[PDB]
């Protein structure tokens, strides 16, 4: 049963791996939806329909990454549903970037949970990949997603429809 | 509540299309989960699982086309849960080939339904939008899918690892 | 009297494409108006008066390709008066970007009949000219044209001058 | 009421501006009939109907001219209805070619008559106008299509349909 | 006996579809008599030669095109003889023209029929294959013929030698 | 009656010329039913495909070039029925390349008794025609065939879908 390539990599640790497979599948499909959104013909924000949309690609690059490692370990995908978002209408520019960030901090905190029990269980290439390839990523999203969500709401998001044409010209454009 | 866009979109098109592309998101993860299948260690084709990695990202380029009609119409994208695959393990080249074919005709069944739904709503547009992107492409597929199969079934495929391991040098490669 | 080249094209066809072939060359005129408003010096938005200017040559572009069909089918082209546009004073660029999304959103309703009527008539030529050259244009049209006014009303047009300024600069421009 | 820019714009100058934008359109649809009643299967003379849609779009182009100046003095635009050309029927490139001089001629008196206004009301801006963009254009497109009419009738048109073919081969293509 | 990639194709879409292509076919052969007929040293028009070669090997372009349709939808090809064309001695470039024409306008006809069917079996992939494919083919070819028809007999053919050698130089040259 | 560029070219030799164009047509559709039958989705070498058409538009060449030898010597071209193939399923790429052996060794005895002709009838143009386009592609596809007929037959072909497959990859591809 055991794979001919394992070697350190602990059961649980396979388990939280399959874990973040499948929420940065679900983190993909949010960005989908808001990109979406962002689409229609009453909301017509092109640049922020641009901006999520490369955020649900880029997720669903992670989680490609994450089935790599997996079977580069020698551990076994499993697969399961994945949960549609808890909106489909989003309110607004600001109210998506915030949404966004909550997702990118839940996404990092489960992040830094499998730092830990990777940590714990003495598996230092799993650490070491974690670091390298999503911690890093994860800090730079929040600190932009931060901003954007700063810039908005000075300018006057959402109610100042201007604020947000004027945002996603400037600075999603 | 009416779109200011819409114009000769009925309801029940509207719902057909969301539930196609949940349909095509489905697809997407089926051919994600037999890709990284192919990556596995002890199974460890390469060029399969680059096939099955292309074709999922082009079930999601089809779903995001939807999407995007969805909008240009007025309608409204409602999104529910992508179902996970009906495997884990597929087996073999031949085997995921097989399931990949019985999949793209499930598709294309789907198209078919759409397609006599927006004809009987009298949708011109939709029937034509349904024929120039889909319809084709779903009948390529399946032939391509239904050579592949032959071809490995000819060669001597599962059984023959030497037939899958050529197959994926020469076809696939 | 019968063209040598005419075949499977009926009479209420062929006054069908004479009556579109009328409004597409009364659209053209109606950009073309809305257009010079804008040219005004106490208007002076000139990004609103060129995107007006290019739909009226598209829309005479429209007017030339039903003609080519007209004689290709060996129908016989009559044309009638232009009616003058509806207004000489389109009052904003909100106001003419809701109008020019009724126009075309009328000529779309007309296309229908038309395709109605040539699938009625089992002209498939006719349907699929329709289909591939006219609806999906109007589709589109329509769909950036609500965006346009979705924009603009969330901008504060049109009693914000500065409004309809920093859209003629930032969407037209 | 009075444009901010108007200086030295007679009423009069501003009406005959407008009707002569009204006869240049007239002129563009007059040679889009003829453009197209020569690309029809049983006339089939495509370079008289490349020359004529030529035409058509030169005259559009100077009734957009004359639009352009209207604003640029400060008048202000009317349309008003473009009507049908006088036949539907052209009868041979001769017919349609003495009836283009007979028109080109019509809208020569017609800036005639305007120039002798515009001097009349001391306006030597819109004299230059006139003389510049018009006059000598006019002079021009005449001596053109006598050309034409003088060669078609040395050559035996309308009756030597070999005539009109080598005609619109030689000349015209 | 089912193909494995067969959907939504009935047995009198096959049918029809092999009859076709043996239309098709014939009117090849057709075309390649009409060419090697002004190949002859006593009519010696070399550029009627080579339109009819052309359109020969257009037609064979087309049954090859069916043929690959017959394969993608699972359904198999059936070939039937090639009968030899109506005339050996085709008299004239006018008449082989008209020839032509009747010969384009019969192949219309029978694709009209065969998306009849098509419609009628509700296969939207087979009716969109022959409106994308071949109804726009038909029409542009048959009104082209028209076109060389008419000229040609304005100018005098088939008595006119002179013209059938400027024709065979000026237009097919 | 008699061509006047007609010297040296007997009756018998003529009609044997139209014999041979009659048989290279045949030819060229044998091998286009060959091509199709690997397109199939239940055989699918796409370079015996490949290789067949190519084959039947080489027949195809061959025929025109004996049609355009007819009309030099002031022959007249008289077509006949092309028959359909013996076979609509070829079963197997072994199969069809004895076929096209033999297919071709019958032609080559045609073309061998035309050379015998022409030299009874002392045609030495003839018989050079003959001798340079024909003999020397005959003598080289059979063996061609022949090579292939081996070398399928040493692989384990027909029962060998191995040996099928690698053939068309390595040798035909
Ligand atoms: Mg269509
Ligand atoms: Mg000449
Ligand atoms: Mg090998
Ligand atoms: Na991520
Ligand atoms: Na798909
Ligand atoms: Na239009
Ligand atoms: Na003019
Ligand atoms: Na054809
Ligand atoms: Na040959």
Redesign the interface.
């Known amino acids: 049963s055991t794979?001919?390539?394992r070697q350190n990599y602990h059961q649980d640790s396979e388990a939280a791996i399959n874990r973040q497979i499948n929420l940065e599948?679900y983190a993909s499909?949010v960005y989908?939806?808001m990109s979406?959104?962002f689409?229609?013909?009453?909301?017509?924000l092109?640049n922020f329909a641009k901006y999520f949309?490369h955020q649900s690609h880029e997720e669903?690059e992670h989680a490609?990454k994450l089935?790599?490692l997996?079977?580069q370990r020698?551990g076994?995908?499993?697969?399961?549903?994945?949960?549609?978002?808890d909106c489909?209408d989003w309110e607004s520019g600001l109210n998506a970037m915030e949404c966004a960030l909550h997702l990118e901090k839940n996404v990092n905190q489960s992040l830094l949970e499998l730092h830990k029990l990777a940590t714990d269980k003495n598996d230092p290439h799993l650490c070491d990949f974690i670091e390298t390839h999503y911690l890093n990523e994860q800090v730079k999203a929040i600190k932009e997603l931060g901003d954007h969500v700063t810039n908005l709401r000075k300018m006057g998001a959402p109610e100042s429809?201007?604020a947000?044409?004027?945002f996603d010209?400037h600075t999603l454009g």
Chains 1, 2, 3, 4, 5, 6 share one sequence.
Do not use: T
């Open positions: 794979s001919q390539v599948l499909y989908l939806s979406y959104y689409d229609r013909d009453d909301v017509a092109k949309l669903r490609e089935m790599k997996q079977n020698g076994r995908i499993f697969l399961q549903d994945i949960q549609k978002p489909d429809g201007l947000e044409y004027l010209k």
